[PDB]
Amino acid sequence: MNKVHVSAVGTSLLKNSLSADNVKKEVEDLGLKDWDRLKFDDDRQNKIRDNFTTLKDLLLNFLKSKGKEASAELDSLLSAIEKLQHKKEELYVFLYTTNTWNSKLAGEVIKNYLEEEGIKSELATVKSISSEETFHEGIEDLFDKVIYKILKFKEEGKEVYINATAGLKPETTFLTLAGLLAGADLVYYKYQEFNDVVFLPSPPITISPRYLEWLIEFANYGYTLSEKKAEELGIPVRLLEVRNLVERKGEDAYRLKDWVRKMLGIYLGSEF
Template identity: 30%
Template sequence: MKLAILNTVGTSILSNMERTAKNLNLTGTPEEVRKMLEEGKLSRLSPDDPLQDKIEHMTHRGDPLFEAAVDFVRKDPGRASAELNALISFLSDFPYKQFEELEIYLYPTDTGTGKFCAGVIHEYLTRHGDEFMRKVGISTRPSIPEPIVIKGLGRNIDWFSEGLIELVDKFARLIINKTRNGYKVVVNATAGFKPETTYIALIAQLTGAWKIIYMHETFHRIVELPKLPLTIQDRYIEELRKIGQGTPLNALQQMGVNVNDLIERGLVTNKEGFIKPREWIQKLLDILPTT
C-alpha cells in the first residue's frame, strides 16, 4: 500500500511548551519571545503581531527556541503535538505495518507561529523518523517534504476570497494526483483554525480523499469523519466548462446556461455582462478529470 497523510498544523507545540516553559533550556532565546512563552501568550499571538515575523525567522536548525522545541517533541510527541498525537493514534491502529510508500505532508497556518510548529514537526520526523515509527509499530520510514504554506490561511478573513485558490492548487491538486498514482490519501484535520479546516475537509471530500480523521478534544480519540456524497453536480461542471475562461452573458443565455443560478451559488462573477468562473473554481476545473 502507498499512503499519503496530509496534516493541518496549528500551534499546539508552543501552547504545550508554555505549560513547562520555566523548565526548558531557552538560553539564547530573545527576551521578548521567552517572556511571551513563559506567560502563555506566544501560541496565541494575533496574526499581525510583529513577533510573528521574528518567530518565523527562528525556524531553523541551531536556533535555541527551535532546538528546544524539537527536543520537547522528541521526549513525548503525543503530548507535545496535537498533530503527532492524532498520527500516533491513527497509525497505531492501522492494519498495515509496512508500506510501499509512506508520505507525510504538513500544512501550517500562514503565520510565524504556525510555520514554526510545522518546521519543528518536520525537523523531528526528519531526525527521528525511525524512532517515531517504532512508537506506532511501523517499519517504513516516512518521506516528509518541506511544509506547504497556503497563502493567507489563518491570517485574516480575506483568506476566503484568495486563499481558496491556493487551497485548491496546493491541497486539492495533491489529493487528486496522489490518488491517480495509487496512493490512499488521509487528511488529518485535527489542528489549525476551525473555519479553515472545515473548508479543508470539504475540499478533501470533493476531491476523493480516502479518509478524513480528527482527534476529538473531549474524548481524546481518533474520529473518522463520515464521507458524505459531496460533489459538484455534473450539470454545473458542464455549464462552467462552457464558460471556459470567460464568455459574454448573451452568448451563454443562447446556449441555455442558467447564469443567474451560477451567480447565486457563488461559482461565477458577472462584470459588465462578461461571465467568468471564480478563480478557485477555475483551478478546481483545471484539475478535475474530464469525462
C-alpha cells in the same frame, strides 16, 4: 509509501510547550510570550526567524520529553495510524501550514519528530488568511499547494487520509470538500474529549454533472458570458450566482469566479 496522511499544522505545540520551565524562560527572554497567536506580520515573527534553529531544538527536546500529546497534529496522526494499523515503511505524512514564522516553527518540529520515529513527511506552506480580501488568495493557494497534491498522490495510486483535527474550521471544511473531490479516501478526527479517533462520513463525491457542464461552458468562452449567450446555452446564471459560482461583473454579463476557475484547472483537465 502508499499511505498518505494529510494534516494542517496549528500552534498547539507552541502553546503547550510553555508548561516546561526552560521553554517558558527562553520564550520570555526573547519577547515571544504570545508566540502561539502572533499575527502574520507581527514584528516578533522576526525573533522566531532569527532564533529558528535554537527554538527548533528546544521544542524538539520538549516533545521528546513530554510525548505526542503536546501537539494536536502528532496526537491525532499517531492515534489514527495506530487505529488504521499503518506501518511506518508504508506512511508518508503531508503537513501544511501558513507561511509565517510561528507556524513554520511548529511544522518543522513536527516534521523532525516524525522523521526520528521513522516516518517520512513534508511541510508545504500556504498564504496567510488575514482578511476577507486575503481569504480568496488563501483558498487559491490551498488548491495549488494541497488539493493539487492530493490529486497527484491519487494518480500515483496512493491512499489519502485527511486528518481533520488541526486547522481553523473554514480551512478544514475546504480541505475536506476539495480533498474528497480530489479523490481522498477517508477523513478522520480525534476528539480530545474522549481520546479516540473517528471516521467522518466521507462518501466519494463529484461536482453535480449538470453544473460541471455549465461551468465548462464558461471556460469555453473565455470566462465570461452575456446573459443572452447564457440563456441560449440554457445556463441559469441566476442559480450559479446564488451558489457563489459566478459574479455579475458586466452590464449584462456574468464572469466565472476565480476559485471555480482554479478548481476546474486543478481537477478535470489542466488547460483553458
